[PDB]
Amino acid sequence: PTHLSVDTKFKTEGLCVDIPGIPKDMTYRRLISMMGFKMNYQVNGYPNMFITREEAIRHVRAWIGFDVEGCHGTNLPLQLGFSTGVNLVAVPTPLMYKGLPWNVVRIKIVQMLSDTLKNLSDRVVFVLWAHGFELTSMKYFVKIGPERTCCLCDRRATCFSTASDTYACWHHSIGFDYVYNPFMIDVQQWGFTGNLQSNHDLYCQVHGNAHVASCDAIMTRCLAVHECFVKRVDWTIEYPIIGDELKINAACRKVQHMVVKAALLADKFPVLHDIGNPKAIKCVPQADVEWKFYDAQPCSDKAYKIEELFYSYHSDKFTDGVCLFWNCNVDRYPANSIVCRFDTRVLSNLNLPGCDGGSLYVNKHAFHTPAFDKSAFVNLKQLPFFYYSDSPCESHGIDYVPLKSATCITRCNLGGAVCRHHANEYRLYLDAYNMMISAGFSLWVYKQFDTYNLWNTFT
Numbered sequence: 347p348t349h350l351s352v353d354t355k356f357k358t359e360g361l362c363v364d365i366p367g368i369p370k371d372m373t374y375r376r377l378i379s380m381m382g383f384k385m386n387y388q389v390n391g392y393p394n395m396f397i398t399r400e401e402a403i404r405h406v407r408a409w410i411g412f413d414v415e416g417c418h419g420t421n422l423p424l425q426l427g428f429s430t431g432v433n434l435v436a437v438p439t440p441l442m443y444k445g446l447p448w449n450v451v452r453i454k455i456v457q458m459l460s461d462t463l464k465n466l467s468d469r470v471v472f473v474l475w476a477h478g479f480e481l482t483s484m485k486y487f488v489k490i491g492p493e494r495t496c497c498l499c500d501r502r503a504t505c506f507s508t509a510s511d512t513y514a515c516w517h518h519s520i521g522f523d524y525v526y527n528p529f530m531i532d533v534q535q536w537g538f539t540g541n542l543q544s545n546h547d548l549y550c551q552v553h554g555n556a557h558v559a560s561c562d563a564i565m566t567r568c569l570a571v572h573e574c575f576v577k578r579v580d581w582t583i584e585y586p587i588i589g590d591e592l593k594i595n596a597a598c599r600k601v602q603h604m605v606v607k608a609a610l611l612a613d614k615f616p617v618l619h620d621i622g623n624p625k626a627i628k629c630v631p632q633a634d635v636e637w638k639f640y641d642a643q644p645c646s647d648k649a650y651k652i653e654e655l656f657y658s659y660h661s662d663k664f665t666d667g668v669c670l671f672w673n674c675n676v677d678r679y680p681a682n683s684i685v686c687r688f689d690t691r692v693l694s695n696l697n698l699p700g701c702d703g704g705s706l707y708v709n710k711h712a713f714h715t716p717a718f719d720k721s722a723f724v725n726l727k728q729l730p731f732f733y734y735s736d737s738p739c740e741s742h743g744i745d746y747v748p749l750k751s752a753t754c755i756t757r758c759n760l761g762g763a764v765c766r767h768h769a770n771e772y773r774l775y776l777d778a779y780n781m782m783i784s785a786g787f788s789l790w791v792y793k794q795f796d797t798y799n800l801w802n803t804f805t
């Protein structure tokens with residue numbers, strides 16, 4: 347059972363207000379036919395327009411909430427809402443666009459999905475809370491058929507042009523008018539009691555209902571994200587590389603080793619409490635320190651309460667030494683900490699919008715992270731940039747412009763002039779640091795941290 351069967355039953359109760367007298371007994375096959383699409387028995391890689399929850403989770407980057415609200419059904423004009431915040435009005439003659447015919451509306455839809463998804467995914471998945479109009483309106487902007495490749499590249503086709511009779515991916519679809527072979531999933535098929543707002547509002551206060559179609563489209567995708575990534579967590583699903591994932595993860599490993607090595611040299615803590623990943627290894631394996639591990643998985647709902655991680659009866663004394671919280675999101679960190687906390691507000695192709703202020707960070711695996719809260723770090727300060735190194739000054743083996751910096755903490759810089767080796771290593775580390783910061787990670791440290799205490803290790 348790879349794909350969803352077209353002979354699977356579809357509960358049509360949520361459709362009977364827009365579609366009165368709809369058969370209670372309904373399959374995907376009959377629904378697709380009712381929507382105006384002919385599948386003609388096609389074993390060409392597109393078995394069903396509707397997909398399973400497991401396939402939807404594998405393609406979370408393609409999710410676009412979609413909702414259609416009648417303003418007045420081929421007689422009345424429809425308001426099309428997308429989780430991008432766009433509202434288009436179609437006439438059959440929170441960005442609100444005036445009533446325009448379908449032939450020009452469909453052009454805007456391909457432009458919008460292409461610009462939203464070209465750097466995210468090879469497809470679109472319309473996430474629905476289906477009442478009728480969104481499915482019946484799909485025939486005015488969707489064309490289906492066999493799986494195809496782009497006319498200008500090797501990616502799968504996601505768009506079609508009537509003007510040129512050709513197919514394109516999101517990167518080459520300029521001027522295309524049809525959405526080609528889209529995917530869709532109805533959240534209402536998952537078994538919920540009550541309307542969209544009542545289910546969404548149970549888990550989210552950040553999205554409201556200004557009573558437009560895009561509001562519902564946003565609430566739909568947020569409810570889907572809550573169900574598939576907040577309450578249900580599967581860390582065994584891998585995701586393709588769509589950006590700087592390899593560089594960001596290597597930058598995070600270098601920064602961690604650096605920052606923890608220097609805190610241990612500067613303040614010589616006798617014990618380090620490493621709270622987080624149950625699979626974590628010592629990031630500074632040569633340190634003298636008593637390294638103690640505490641397991642806590644990444645929290646996806648709310649950030650951990652420090653009282654429930656530390657108390658209820660390890661050294662038991664977390665107040666001795668330093669606490670390391672590398673991506674272990676808590677409500678309020680203790681004052682003796684080193685913290686890497688992902689900032690959910692960051693705008694990037696890896697960070698997708700989430701539930702209740704949180705975000706879905708997709709790098710190798712999907713991690714719904716709770717909302718970034720500035721008050722979590724009141725007992726700490728922002729960790730300032732510095733590069734520290736005790737390694738010998740020796741070139742071995744790119745050209746050179748002499749490096750002058752107050753934050754290159756090395757024997758050569760103490761001695762008055764940074765050597766070539768430490769200058770290459772400084773600029774490589776600064777690049778990894780800027781990568782890590784721009785990916786959304788924020789660094790914080792105990793208030794007594796001072797890089798001035800690092801020069802004394804050059805005696």
Ligand SMILES: COCC(=O)Nc1ccc(O)cc1
Nearest residue numbers: 584585586587591592709710
């Ligand atoms: C389908 O998954 C393919 C893959 O290898 N993905 C991957 C993503 C990020 C990363 O940092 C390393 C690997």
Ligand SMILES: [Zn+2]
Nearest residue numbers: 496499515518
């Ligand atoms: Zn292409």
Ligand SMILES: [Zn+2]
Nearest residue numbers: 550553568702
């Ligand atoms: Zn929400």
Ligand SMILES: [Zn+2]
Nearest residue numbers: 739758765768
């Ligand atoms: Zn040097």
